[PDB]
From a paper:
The overall structure of boCD1d is very similar to that of other CD1 or MHC I molecules, in which the boCD1d heavy chain is organized in 3 domains, α1 and α2 that form the central binding groove and α3, which non-covalently associates with boβ2M. The glycolipids are bound in the hydrophobic binding groove that can further be divided into the two main pockets, A and F. While the A pocket binds the acyl chain of each glycolipid, the F pocket binds the sphingosine, leaving the structurally distinct carbohydrate headgroups exposed above the boCD1d binding groove for immune recognition by cognate T cells.
To address the question of why boCD1d does not bind bovine brain sulfatides to a measurable degree, we crystallized boCD1d in complex with synthetic [name]∶0-di-sulfatide (di-SLF) and determined the crystal structure to a resolution of 2.9 Å. Our structural studies using a short chain [name]-di-sulfatide finally revealed that boCD1d has a restricted A’ pocket, which in contrast to mouse and human [name], can maximally bind glycolipids with alkyl chain lengths approximating C18. A total of 6 H-bonds are formed between boCD1d and di-SLF (four with the headgroup and two with the lipid), which gives rise to ordered electron density for the headgroup. Overall, the orientation of di-SLF in the boCD1d binding groove, and the presentation at the opening of the groove is conserved with the presentation of sulfatide by mCD1d.
Numbering used by the authors:
A (entry chain B): 1 to 97
B (entry chain A): 7 to 105, 110 to 279
């Protein structure tokens, strides 16, 4: 009935400083389906795209956001997610290594 | 191997706000969507049309369209007449595997609620009391039951057969992953976390392992295989190990697109 979301963050391609890449934020296993997902660079939102909402056998929801990004060893990225089951928004950082 | 599956997500916030979106999967590719805004469905692939004629599609469209409006109206009326409280989340899943076996299942507030067996609406064993009223009203409308029967037994199968034929090549493409290694956060004292990333592979079945030469290493933790925007996959596999033992560890990747020629990545220092 109410399932909190699980959040995972990963790049499409091996992160090499300077090469254009894509940052993925996969949010899954949640219910109900209304959810806010933002991709962040040093705190600020960045232009992300988002796939259609879809769902698994047990009826939970899953969804993919991704954003074009160019990593360098300076900047940090994260995924911020808002859902009814969360008292406070949940931030998951992209860990390069 | 490749199942077809049609999905509906309906939400009713209150009596004034509602939305219904749909999509469908064939194996792991998404041929269609029907967004709330659209009066029609999107063919997301050049093979999405299958072998279905234009008149056949138009008919199916219209059927689905009437259904979407009628469905919405019917829920609202079931809510008023049965005093069920908002918000509501309703999910529907149909589809078939050719052996040919069709289903139409429904969930409410995230739990299985009813389905369509044979020619009847049947309540799930676990369903709340009031859906017995729903089932009753639904099993009265003969025309709907006939339209559902016809969809599941006549239309789904003929469709799936066609788009399997036209989507055959894109469905069974093989796409080689790229892969890399990294040093994750320390899991404790003198323990290190070695991470093996594999990304860009399609189809989804993949074996990824830590190793000493030919000896598979257990303590290898699988991550979840998760999607990429381009419908290829990503998988992260880790190992917990002591700083002395770092000697001669390799990650090894088996994938259908590689044949017998696996990808090996070595740790150095
Ligand atoms: C409290 C709620 C919680 C419970 C949640 C579960 C509820 C189950 C959901 C199932 C509800 C299905 C309701 C069916 C809606 C029907 O109104 C429509 C059309 O009804 C037709 O309207 C017709 C008149 O229409 S009008 O001229 O425009 O007014 C006729 O009355 C016709 O009867 S007939 O004897 O003449 O043939 C009648 O059936 N049922 C359908 O359209 C059936 C097709 C179902 C397609 C399912 C596909 C789902 C897959 C999702 C992928 C996008
Ligand atoms: C999902 O789709 C439904 C149905 O397509 C949307 O509801 C519809 O929205 C339209 C246009 O926005 C509404 O039009 C209204 O018409 C009346 C005329 O009497 C007028 O009072 C309003 O000013 C407006 O023009 C219409 O009420 C409504 N249609 C139905 C069948 O409910 C719905 O908003 C979409 N969902 C979301 C979240 O957008
Ligand atoms: C019905 O529900 C919808 C969606 O939940 C409500 O629309 C929102 O209402 C807030 C006010 O709290 C406004 O900021 C916007 O108008 C809407 N936001 C979103 C995210 O939709 C609507 O208020 C509700 N209608 C009634 C009569 O309760």
């Amino acid at each position: 009935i109410q399932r909190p979301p699980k959040i995972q963050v990963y790049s499409r391609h091996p992160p090499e400083d300077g090469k254009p890449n894509y940052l993925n934020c996969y949010v899954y296993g949640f219910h109900p389906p209304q959810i806010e997902i933002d991709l962040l660079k040093n705190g600020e939102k960045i232009k992300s795209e988002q796939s259609d909402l879809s769902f698994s056998k047990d009826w939970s929801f899953y969804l993919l956001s991704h954003a074009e990004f160019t990593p360098n060893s300076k900047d940090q990225y994260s995924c911020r997610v808002k859902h009814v089951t969360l008292e406070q928004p949940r931030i998951v950082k992209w860990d390069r290594d | 191997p490749f199942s077809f599956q049609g999905l509906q997500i309906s939400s009713f916030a209150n009596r004034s706000w509602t939305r219904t979106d749909g999509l469908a999967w064939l194996g792991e590719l998404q041929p269609y969507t029907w967004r709330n805004e659209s009066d029609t469905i999107r063919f997301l692939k050049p093979w999405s049309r299958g072998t279905f004629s234009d008149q056949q599609w138009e008919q199916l469209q219209h059927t689905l369209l009437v259904y979407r409006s009628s469905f919405t109206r019917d829920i609202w009326e079931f809510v008023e007449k049965l005093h069920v409280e908002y918000p509501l989340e309703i999910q529907i899943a149909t589809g078939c595997e050719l052996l040919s076996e069709s289903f139409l299942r429904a969930a409410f507030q995230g739990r299985d609620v009813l389905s369509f067996q044979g020619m009847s609406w049947v309540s799930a064993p676990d369903a709340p009391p009031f859906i017995q009223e729903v089932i009753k009203v639904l099993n009265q409308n003969q025309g709907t039951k006939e339209t559902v029967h016809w969809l599941l037994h006549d239309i789904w199968p003929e469709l799936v057969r066609g788009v399997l034929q036209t989507g055959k090549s894109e469905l069974e493409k093989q796409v080689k992953p790229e892969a890399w290694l990294s040093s994750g956060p320390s899991p404790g004292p003198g323990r290190l976390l070695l991470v093996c990333h594999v990304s860009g592979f399609y189809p989804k079945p993949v074996r990824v392992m830590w190793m000493r030469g030919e000896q598979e290493e257990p303590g290898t933790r699988q991550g979840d295989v998760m999607p990429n925007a381009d419908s290829t996959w990503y998988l992260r596999v880790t190992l917990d190990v002591a700083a002395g033992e770092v000697a001669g560890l390799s990650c090894q990747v088996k994938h259908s697109s590689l044949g017998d020629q696996d990808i090996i990545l070595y740790w150095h220092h």
